[PDB]
Write a structure and sequence with these properties.
Layout (H helix, E strand, L loop, with lengths): L10 E11 L2 E12 L4 E8 L31 H4 L5 E9 L4 E11 L2 E11 L19 E8 L4 E11 L5 E12 L11 E10 L8 E11 L3 H4 L3
Parallel strand pairs: 1-6
Antiparallel strand pairs: 1-2, 2-3, 3-11, 4-5, 4-9, 5-6, 7-8, 7-10, 8-9, 10-11
């Protein structure tokens, strides 16, 4: 659709997150840019209120799937761009195994030339000495595949997927994600055939940044609809 046209070049990104996990209140801001032709995100996130009370890796999925690279042969399955510029609501529940859960509601839309992700996060039932509030997770991120399904009654999409966070004692912390997206505007959107998104994430630090922060380099590519192209060879 015409939402596609908004992503042909590099697009500035602004992320704002208001959080409260077990009563620990915090704000995060992020800035950077996205290049959907390559599925590429480059963002720096800052906790503006002090030390982040949860580990940075647990916020990665919450902190703009419109920047995913949809291959040409899958362009008709790109819901996220089709909802632009008016945007979409993205809601999740994230259950950390043997710990608490996040509930997030975000609006992703253009403000002028800037793609904005505005998020509210509420976390409950965490263990104060667990892996999350105890900052026992490794500062890294595993590659992962997430299936995208159409949700016709809601004119949107759904996704359920698991994130595995590495724990410093050698184990793995499961984070079970349940996601729903719905357009904000009324124009037609692309409802996709079943497919998945392949992600990878590199987390790093800014040596000159005194605030608690995360530098993120992310690549996301849509895949899984293959048979028609395969027959060409």
């Amino acid at each position: 659709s015409k939402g596609e046209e908004l992503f042909t070049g590099v697009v500035p990104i602004l992320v704002e997150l208001d959080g409260d996990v077990n009563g620990h209140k915090f704000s995060v801001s992020g800035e950077g840019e996205g290049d959907a032709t390559y599925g590429k995100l480059t963002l720096k996130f800052i906790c503006t209120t002090g030390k982040l009370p949860v580990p940075w890796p647990t916020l990665v999925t919450t902190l703009v799937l419109c920047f995913s690279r949809y291959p040409d042969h899958m362009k008709q399955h790109d819901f996220f761009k089709s909802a632009m510029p008016e945007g979409y609501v993205q809601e999740r529940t994230i259950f950390f195994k043997d710990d608490g859960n996040y509930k997030t509601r975000a609006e992703v839309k253009f403000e002028g030339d800037t793609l904005v992700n505005r998020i509210e996060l509420k976390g409950i039932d965490f263990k104060e000495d667990g892996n999350i509030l105890g900052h026992k997770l490794e500062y890294n991120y595993n590659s992962h595949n997430a299936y995208i399904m159409a949700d016709k009654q809601k004119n949107g999409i759904k996704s359920n997927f698991k994130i595995r966070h590495n724990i410093e004692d050698g184990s793995v912390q499961l984070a079970d994600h349940y996601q729903q997206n719905t357009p904000i505007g009324d124009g037609p959107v692309l409802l996709p055939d079943n497919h998945y998104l392949s992600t990878q994430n590199k987390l790093s630090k800014d040596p000159n940044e005194k605030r608690d922060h995360m530098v993120l380099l992310e690549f996301v590519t849509a895949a899984g609809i293959t048979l028609g192209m395969d027959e060409l060879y």
